[PDB]
Amino acid sequence: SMQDPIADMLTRIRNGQAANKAAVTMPSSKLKVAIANVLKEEGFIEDFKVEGDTKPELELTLKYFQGKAVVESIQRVSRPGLRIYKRKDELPKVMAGLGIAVVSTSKGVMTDRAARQAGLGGEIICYVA
Amino acid sequence: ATVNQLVRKPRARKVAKSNVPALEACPQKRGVCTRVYTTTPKKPNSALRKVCRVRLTNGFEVTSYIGGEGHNLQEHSVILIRGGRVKDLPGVRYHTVRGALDCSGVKDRKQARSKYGVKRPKA
Amino acid sequence: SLSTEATAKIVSEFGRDANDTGSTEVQVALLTAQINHLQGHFAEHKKDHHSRRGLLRMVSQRRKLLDYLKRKDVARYTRLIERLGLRR
Amino acid sequence: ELQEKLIAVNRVSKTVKGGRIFSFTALTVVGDGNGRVGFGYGKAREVPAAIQKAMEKARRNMINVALNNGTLQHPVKGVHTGSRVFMQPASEGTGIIAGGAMRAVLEVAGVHNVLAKAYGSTNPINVVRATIDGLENMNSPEMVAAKRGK
Amino acid sequence: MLKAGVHFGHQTRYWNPKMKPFIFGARNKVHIINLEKTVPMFNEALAELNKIASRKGKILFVGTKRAASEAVKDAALSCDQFFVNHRWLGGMLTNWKTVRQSIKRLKDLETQSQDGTFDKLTKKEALMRTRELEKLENSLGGIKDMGGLPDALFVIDADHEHIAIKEANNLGIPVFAIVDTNSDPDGVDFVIPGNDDAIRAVTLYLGAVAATVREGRS
RNA sequence: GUAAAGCGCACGCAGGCGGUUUGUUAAGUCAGAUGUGAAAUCCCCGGGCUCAACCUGGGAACUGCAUCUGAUACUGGCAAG
RNA sequence: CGGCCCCCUGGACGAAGACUGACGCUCAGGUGCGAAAGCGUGGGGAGCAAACAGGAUUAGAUACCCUGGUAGUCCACGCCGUAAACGAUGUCGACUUGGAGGUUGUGCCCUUGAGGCGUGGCUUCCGGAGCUAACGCGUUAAGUCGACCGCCUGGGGAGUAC
């Protein structure tokens, strides 16, 4: 959005899923693609690309196993006016461990397990189940 | 509300109103007994019950219920208020202790001796 | 609103170049005119409120621009407020 | 073996020309200590006749929960109508921690260790299903690897 | 540029605020159903049918509508499955218990003409009894082969076959319906935003359904 | 929305929030460490009164404040866009 | 906010474009605008009409009905700030099937036409997913989200007392 560009990413992804869409598109961003990269390895998204050397536009591909979709849970937490910063011993564990939790570390964007395995903390980004 | 709207004017409490004039945070209070009434209950019930105005030690006057199947108080006898209001009797949110001070206590009662005025019957 | 022979006129007086109808120095100044000119209009009628709403708009809108200059080039601010006899 | 359980039964009425008639309802949950359940709800002019229907209707239209070691894989969360129910799995040792409906629906689904709570309306007719919908969503730790493995 | 060029749009401005993310864009009185939002639905649904068909399940095609009745069997009956091209009885999915009872007198009614057991009773009687077939063999004649609730229900228009879908979501029987602009897709777990009408739209997809189902079980 | 609850409507100061890129900073933040966080409570493991209550060793914790050395993804500051 | 005309003036929208370069969103307090009724001074006053007066109705009729009729309704200027001031739904932004229609701009099409195909603004009705306690809302959301603000915490007493 014009105020919360990251929160929009999640919404556009979840809104697409519900509508059984194929691919979601929206303006890119260092953090955005960075986040989009994680869900990739996590198998939450098929692939992802962008267009524009001056006018970048993210391109994500939704995913679904059977009748229902894959990403059946995606919400934010560390939003503006109410940001969240956890330690290496406070990091959340989405769905008892199954779901992932994106968190920006001094090393870069990671997941609840990722950063933990490292032994460092960062500003939580969102919960993906 | 929102964090901002909370930081300003948070969540207010609620001064618990303890329905009891003879407060002073006490289990009971001593009285003097102004008189002995026999007022009638509300609309749902009938039969005249026994009550009595009490001049609590703290001045705070108030009518207390005189439960039990047998009254025996006087217009000067000293009783002890306890609590527990009564529906049928409005304004009467108290009861005179049975078997204490210058009062008496139920007679011939063999059940629920603790309550009322009775302590181990004729055996 | 404003006459072309005036709008397209002033633009060529504050623009740091040519046909820069965007430049704050320009737009901002362009606002003072339509404002000062209307003050003579509002002097009459008065009760005409729906027109003042727009008047106030361009006024605050003008200020929103002045604050910007101060937060982009201190000089340009004090360098323009004079040419327009602003601040009063 | 299927284990039925009578949640509760209300009377309910109906005013008409002549006067006013009544017809008890009753709700029943059935299942096995494996991972299958499904409540039932039937009416009747007789206390026993009612439960008879609900039971039949119960055995059918069941469900299959992704239970693990006598408990839930993770703290699921379901809601329905005005009933907000949140269930959470606990290690062996803790009995079934639930009020009414929930406590029952689980004592037949194969649940042994949990600790829920009814937030919204305590209506049995709903809290009973608000729970079933919870487990009905319970994502098992399996398949997830396939849901995004390839 | 493919066959999906026959159900472009339908149902004027009556629409339904819910059916929006599937609207190509209103134009010339009525709107259009974004086919690009239909392509995934075009198969996603069929995929499950193809998958379930392999499980040797059941499929009931509901299409009481005239322009779909006579032209629905060839996709269901011929393909040997289940369908109801008439007044969907009240309970043929929930109160099936008592409904099946009607099927019996229908079957045993059939056997009457089967053998010489038809030349029984006055010539008039046979007539009074034969009428039952007309109704029975019609309202159930295409469901008699269902010895138990199905496993998935594919209904044409989501509006007309309203009650049909209802009972379904009450028994746990998945529903694959080809809704429409004025349709209420909230009851369909597998929406197929297409022209609920159009003599061609119905046939193509309807027949296309049995296609995947046909070899669904390999 | 109809249950209690959108100010009759605007403009707007303070306040809260802030599109995209690169560099930079290292304040927030994260990591490590050093202080300090009284003892006793609480908790874990273990001791002694015949058991328990009780008494008791060591640890855990005291979620905090400060300082130092870093890390630079995100928020913030500065510069050019 | 409705006759026609002139003068002064605000906002909205489209299109080729050209320009500035985050200058933005919200906003307690603050300032301003506010139906009608009402108030002050001075005008005006056809119709209508609180008050008031007759006639009728009725058990009664301080009403409905009928015959009259003053303030008021109208103008100027100042005050009062309320309304079921209602979409009973705060402002701003991004997403999410469809159908029929209205109104206004623009591109295009043997522009040969009433016309046909798009592409923006505002707006009606139906309705899908979803949401909802239900009614119902449904791309102008009461759906999915984000930023800021106002507000609610049982009924009576009471929007009353001080």
Added chain:
RNA sequence: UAACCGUAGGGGAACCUGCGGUUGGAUCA
């Protein structure tokens, strides 16, 4: 005498009447 809100006046009392708004008005107005 559709009701209610505002505002005004009047009357034993609910309430009546005027002006504006509302549908939280029945019947095809």
